[PDB]
Design a binder for this molecule. Structure first.
Ligand SMILES: COc1cc(-c2cncc(-c3ccc(C4CCN(C)CC4)cc3)c2C)cc(OC)c1OC
Ligand SMILES: COc1cc(-c2cncc(-c3ccc(C4CCN(C)CC4)cc3)c2C)cc(OC)c1OC
Ligand SMILES: COc1cc(-c2cncc(-c3ccc(C4CCN(C)CC4)cc3)c2C)cc(OC)c1OC
Length: 285
């Protein structure tokens, strides 16, 4: 009645960590991305699989799902997540070398805001509201058309492993987050979005000037900062990323500085919503 061609050829490893590995693969002559999970991070595969079994997200700024595969091995279970492949790689990767102009900077950040607002919004008929819980530049991929997409729903929570410590909001670091209020999780994503917006804005040229790529808080915490390192910076001293003087000569960067400030309020309920961020970004330039 029909052949079901399941063979995926793994061609090149494009990422390896404690999570496991990501591979460029081939299925029926087309590139796919294959995430192979470590034993240590099986729950990330289960959570993303459970979410996609609940709602088949389809959005230009969400990494495109293809498949979740569990295969029985002699002494172990093998877990793969198969997605669209974005050959330009992560935003983290891309910003290291590349500088941006006004149009490319805005296109990047508005595409991220678009993906994030899609996750956050409940649609009746539709989708549950979704918070990401690990938004960062390594979890955003660059597409050839200049838009980005959001990746890795292994920590996501639906309404109707913990986050990367460098990007944790103050209420996560001081353990005051209202864990029974779904809006709490959206506001944690907004904080992290503001940090990503800062990372990208630094790489936008104005008046012949650009900042070097740096991760958020590069100047105040070590590599692999501890919870305590982050809590002292963000909660106790209430530091925020630096806005360089040169941004205030450029109307786009002046507007982006204002926006990122309104993602970083200590009071989570004062932060902008993803929908409000989108509207603000459509009115810039
Ligand atoms: C099991 O595993 C994998 C399967 C595949 C795959 C390969 N060929 C064809 C298919 C297919 C799709 C859909 C139908 C429909 C047709 C309409 N009818 C009314 C209901 C059924 C049938 C067949 C699939 C799903 C790829 C994989 O990897 C890319 C798989 O591994 C994860
Ligand atoms: C998993 O991913 C991929 C899958 C496939 C693929 C392979 N065989 C059959 C199908 C299919 C056919 C028909 C229906 C429907 C059509 C309308 N109604 C009658 C209900 C049933 C569904 C599915 C697909 C989608 C191709 C892909 O790429 C070209 C995939 O992407 C990598
Ligand atoms: C963040 O997380 C996930 C990401 C991906 C993913 C999807 N497309 C492309 C990539 C990629 C491709 C290529 C490079 C390099 C190699 C060549 N060049 C010299 C520099 C660029 C880097 C990255 C990835 C890593 C898939 C995932 O799941 C299957 C992820 O997990 C949810």
């Amino acid at each position: 009645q029909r052949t079901v061609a399941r063979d995926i050829t793994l061609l090149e490893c494009v990422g390896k960590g404690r999570y496991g590995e990501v591979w460029r693969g081939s299925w029926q002559g087309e590139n796919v991305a294959v995430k192979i999970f470590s034993s240590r991070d099986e729950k990330s595969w289960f959570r993303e699989t459970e979410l996609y079994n609940t709602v088949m997200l389809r959005h230009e700024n969400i990494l495109g799902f293809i498949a979740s595969d569990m295969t029985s091995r002699h002494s172990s279970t093998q877990l793969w997540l198969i997605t669209h492949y974005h050959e330009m790689g992560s935003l983290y990767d891309y910003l290291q070398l590349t500088t941006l102009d006004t149009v490319s900077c805005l296109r990047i950040v508005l595409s991220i805001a678009s993906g994030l607002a899609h996750l956050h919004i409940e649609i009746f008929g539709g989708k549950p509201a979704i918070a990401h819980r690990d938004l960062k530049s390594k979890n955003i991929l660059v597409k050839k058309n200049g838009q980005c997409c959001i990746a890795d729903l292994g920590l996501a929570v639906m309404h109707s492993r913990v986050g990367t410590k460098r990007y944790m909001a103050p209420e996560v670091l001081d353990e005051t987050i209202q864990v029974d209020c779904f809006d709490s999780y959206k506001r944690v994503d907004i904080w992290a979005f503001g940090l990503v917006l800062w990372e990208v804005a630094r790489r936008m040229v104005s008046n012949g000037i650009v900042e070097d790529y740096k991760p958020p808080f590069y100047d105040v915490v070590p590599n692999d900062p501890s919870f305590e390192d982050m809590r002292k910076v963000v909660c106790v001293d209430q530091q925020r990323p630096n806005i360089p003087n040169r941004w205030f000569s450029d109307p786009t960067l002046t507007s982006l500085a204002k926006l990122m400030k309104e993602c970083w309020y200590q009071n989570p309920s004062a932060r902008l919503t993803a929908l409000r961020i989108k509207k603000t970004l459509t009115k810039i330039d």
